[PDB]
Design a protein around this nucleic acid. Structure first.
Ligand SMILES: [Mg+2]
Ligand SMILES: [Mg+2]
Length: 861
RNA sequence: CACCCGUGCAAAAAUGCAGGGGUCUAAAACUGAGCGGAUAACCUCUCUAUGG
RNA sequence: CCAUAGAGAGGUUAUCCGCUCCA
């Protein structure tokens, strides 16, 4: 929407007395355009300008650019920020007024410019996007313990890298009671049958078989994840504050375990590439007679794994099926080998366009870049496809007639020896030459969904690209880039970016272990709610009897083998079994308002499909009628009678989707408050250095927002009222406003230290939705996930504060929370006060409508 | 539809207009041609399992 | 033999995140 950004004005920096401007270069690169010194402009980039200045004024610059459509826009002078209607030109400061402190921390001294602060804030944001995912992985691992009752377990909380497994093993005969339980929890964790759900991190493939890793390696993985969560959320004093940025000093055991876990896919991709694609390689070698097979395998590797020339500027898939349309290859005979035939045809087209038809590819991309309507694009594709078919008909037929029958088997067993030294110089780098930060990121991604795997890496790509662009900009201007010894990790930001993009080239979701079907069957029974009178030591025997494991399902066993054949292998069940406690997600599925409201986010196509598969007329009554089908699903104990069974068998996928969506987005909601508390700790640490008496944050979490606001606690409560002088003497720019200072003070006067402490503990340990089955029991309506999550956490707080002394404000809040079966809109802003020093974050995390980026709504005062 | 900042005009403190903000929040960037990952329907084959 | 379910292969249509090239 910003016409200034549309016209190409990437940034407006301000260093010293001058002001520099930049434009959008190639991708995320920034290129200087011109500099301003007191309404006098000296242009830069004379060779290829991006925009020109029409009139330059003290309070703004007018530009016109030709990025897309010629649009004229106006920018504002950075030196004039906070210098309007009441020394008129100075470098702007941040909202928190921590710019000098952050600069003196990251770099060796103060800087009289606002370029370094943006890089520092990007570095800070790197930690923000890691705490959300790191505490999410810890949620899954801690939840894999399958605790049935109320669970407050904390295993990874105490884990630290400073001690190795040799010292940890010394706690077996230790005379301290706490260390006994510390070791017993680890023993129970490694003895768990559900570690097979993360076989890529907990299992090693050594006919051979994949077995559980050694205890030392399991402990190292667990300690690494726990310490990453600890460092991401908390802010430790001393050298522990720079653990992620000085992972070089990790112990030998942790280094070796990181190397081993990272080497698992790379060895599977490089060392057995020929063995995995032998049939295709041999067929292509027979086709391309004149080429060298050593170069052919390298080209195939570039086409499949690296995929660096694949961005040819046109859709090879669409080209291939415009070429093959209307021919004999659409028959039902070739679907058994389509997966190889189509890919080999794509490789043939890609090689042709790379080598001999590069000019034709350039002409095609030029024509496509100026295309008007959809009719033109398909016509150009049809013409190119006609040429490609007339050129490659014989080769395609030769491939197709040698891709069936005994020939596939013969080429699948025949040995092929190939000089591979050419392929080595293109193989993706092993763990030997890959940095510990990226290896740790890879290890972390083993414990979360594939969608979050992509999101976590890509955000890191963007952040490191921004860091690199900022660093490059300050080298052109002659500024200082050299970080202090604490943060020297960022000097190699280019190589970290390269390693991260290389990792993203091949990263996939977590992989199960083939010997993990009995546990998944039991888990599916628990999730669907099928119960048996048999004990724990007999249900396993019954599962072994039915499976007789490579499955051998007996005849006419009914739901017993129906589940084993149709619900263990489902992708939805794979997603849900590693996320959410199986014996708990059934009870929360009984919340009719919760399932009814979550069904609104489900696509109107999925809803129609599953309504047509259960009932035999508006969408609202459709959703309502299928919501109670999801809620009260039932089965047997372990015409219409079979019909009501088939209905519940059909509703299984929608049930699993509903549960997974609810749990995932509730954890996403909790991630915001995890980030907020991390920020509170970090900013307390920063303000402590700047010269502000912040007190002890651990005792009272509102100490930051009290010291910044200027108030203090005496006799347990604040004895200071509103006075306009306090607003203007605030430590940061957020609280300089009188009305919001007053509102934050008012909400702060009705909070409790213990309540805020437990809010912090519940947000960090994720207990609010770990005991979701208890805290969701009585809800009248659900309006959004903000409301649902806050109801859950308020119910948890009331449940624990049942017998402890609670003062008038919290008592009134709990009374409201019990009278109305919905979250109390005042309790949230009462216990959200530790974020008051950051007013925008505080308002985002208190009133809904402002909470969600994708769901804007009206804000009430 | 949040917060802050610039300018213009009523006005004694804020409103109305029009803009900017990687240095505000999970939150800087318009269009076309594509690439990778993930999800959700529909069509056609193959392999399943439940039922009449 | 028909109904339903779930997987694998190939396409089609939305959607989100990131990246390359051009204007
Ligand atoms: Mg904690
Ligand atoms: Mg930012």
């Amino acid at each position: 929407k910003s016409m200034a950004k549309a016209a190409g004005v990437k940034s407006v920096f301000a260093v010293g007395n001058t002001v520099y401007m930049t434009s959008f270069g190639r991708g995320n690169d920034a290129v200087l355009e011109q500099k301003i010194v007191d309404t006098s402009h000296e242009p830069l980039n004379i060779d290829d300008p991006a925009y020109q200045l029409n009139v330059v004024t003290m309070n703004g610059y007018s530009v016109t650019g030709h990025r897309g459509e010629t649009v004229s826009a106006v920018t504002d002078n950075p030196l004039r920020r906070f210098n309007g209607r009441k020394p008129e030109q100075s470098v702007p400061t941040d909202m928190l007024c921590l710019k000098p402190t952050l600069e003196k921390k990251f770099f060796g001294k103060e800087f009289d410019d606002n370029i370094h602060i943006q890089l520092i804030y990007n570095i800070l944001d790197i930690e923000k996007i890691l705490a959300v995912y790191s505490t999410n992985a810890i949620y899954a691992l801690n939840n894999m313990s399958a605790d049935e009752n109320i669970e407050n377990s904390d295993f990874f909380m105490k884990r630290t890298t400073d001690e190795t497994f040799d010292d940890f093993e010394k706690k077996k005969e230790s005379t301290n009671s706490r260390e006994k339980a510390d070791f017993d929890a680890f023993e129970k964790f490694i003895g768990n049958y559900r570690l097979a759900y993360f076989a890529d991190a907990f299992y090693v493939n050594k006919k051979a078989k994949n077995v559980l890793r050694e205890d030392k390696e399991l402990y190292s993985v667990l300690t690494l994840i726990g310490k990453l969560r600890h460092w991401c959320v908390h802010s430790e004093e001393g050298r522990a504050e720079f653990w992620l940025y000085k992972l070089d000093e990790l112990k030998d055991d942790f280094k070796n375990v990181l190397d081993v876990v990272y080497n698992r896919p790379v060895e599977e991709i490089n060392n057995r590439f020929i063995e995995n694609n032998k049939v295709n390689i041999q067929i292509l070698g027979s086709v391309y007679k004149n080429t060298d097979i050593a170069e052919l395998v390298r080209s195939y590797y570039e086409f499949l794994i690296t995929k660096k020339y694949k961005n040819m500027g046109f859709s090879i898939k669409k080209l291939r099926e415009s070429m093959l349309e209307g021919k004999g290859y659409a028959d039902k005979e070739y679907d058994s080998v389509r997966n190889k035939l189509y890919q080999m045809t794509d490789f043939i087209l890609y090689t042709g366009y790379i080598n001999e038809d590069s000019d034709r590819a350039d002409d095609l991309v030029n024509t496509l870049r100026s295309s008007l309507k959809e009719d033109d694009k398909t016509t150009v594709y049809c013409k190119e496809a006609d040429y490609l078919w007339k050129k490659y008909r014989e080769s395609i037929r030769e491939v197709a007639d040698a891709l069936d029958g005994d020939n596939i088997k013969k080429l699948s067993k025949s040995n092929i020896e190939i000089q591979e030294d050419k392929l080595r110089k293109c193989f993706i780098s092993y763990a030997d030459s890959v940095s510990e930060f990226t290896k740790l990121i890879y290890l972390l991604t083993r414990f979360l969904s594939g969608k979050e795997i992509n999101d976590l890496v890509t955000t890191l790509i963007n952040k490191f690209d921004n860091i690199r662009s900022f660093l490059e900009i300050m080298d052109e201007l002659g500024l200082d880039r050299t970080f202090t010894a604490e943060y020297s990790f960022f000097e190699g930001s280019t190589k970290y970016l390269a390693e991260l993009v290389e990792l993203n080239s091949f990263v996939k979701s977590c992989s199960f272990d083939i010997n993990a079907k009995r546990t998944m069957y039991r888990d599916a029974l628990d999730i669907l709610g099928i119960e048996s009178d048999k004990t724990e030591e007999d249900i396993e025997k019954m599962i072994d009897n039915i499976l007789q494991i490579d499955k051998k399902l007996k005849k006419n066993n009914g739901l017993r083998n129906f589940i084993a054949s149709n619900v263990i292998d489902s992708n939805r069940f794979k997603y849900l079994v590693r996320y959410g406690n199986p014996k708990k997600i059934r009870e929360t599925a009984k919340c009719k308002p919760a399932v009814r409201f979550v069904l609104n986010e489900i696509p109107d196509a999925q809803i129609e499909r599953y309504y047509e598969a259960c009932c035999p007329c508006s969408a609202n009554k459709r959703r309502e009628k299928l919501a109670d089908m999801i809620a009260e699903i039932k089965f047997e104990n372990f015409t219409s009678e079979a019909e009501i069974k088939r209905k519940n068998q059909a509703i299984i996928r929608l049930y699993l989707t509903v549960m997974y969506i609810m749990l995932k987005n509730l954890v996403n909601v909790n991630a915001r408050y995890v980030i907020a508390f991390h920020c509170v700790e970090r900013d307390t640490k920063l303000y402590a250095e700047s010269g502000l008496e912040v007190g002890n944050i651990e005792k009272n979490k509102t100490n930051l927002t009290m010291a910044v606001m200027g108030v203090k606690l005496e006799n347990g409560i604040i004895k200071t009222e509103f006075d306009k002088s306090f607003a203007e003497n605030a430590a940061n720019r957020y609280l300089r406003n009188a009305r919001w200072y007053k509102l934050i003070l008012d909400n702060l006067k009705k909070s409790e230290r213990a309540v805020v402490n437990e809010f912090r503990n519940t947000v960090c340990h994720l207990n609010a939705i770990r005991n979701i089955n208890i805290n969701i029991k009585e809800i009248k309506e659900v309006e959004n996930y903000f409301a649902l999550y806050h109801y859950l956490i308020q119910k948890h707080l009331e449940n624990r504060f049942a017998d402890k002394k609670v003062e008038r404000d919290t008592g009134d809040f709990i009374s409201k929370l019990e009278e109305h079966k919905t979250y109390c809109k005042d309790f949230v802003k009462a216990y959200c006060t530790p974020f008051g020093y950051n007013l925008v974050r505080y308002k985002n995390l208190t009133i809904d409508g402002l909470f969600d980026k994708n769901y804007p709504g009206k804000d009430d005062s």
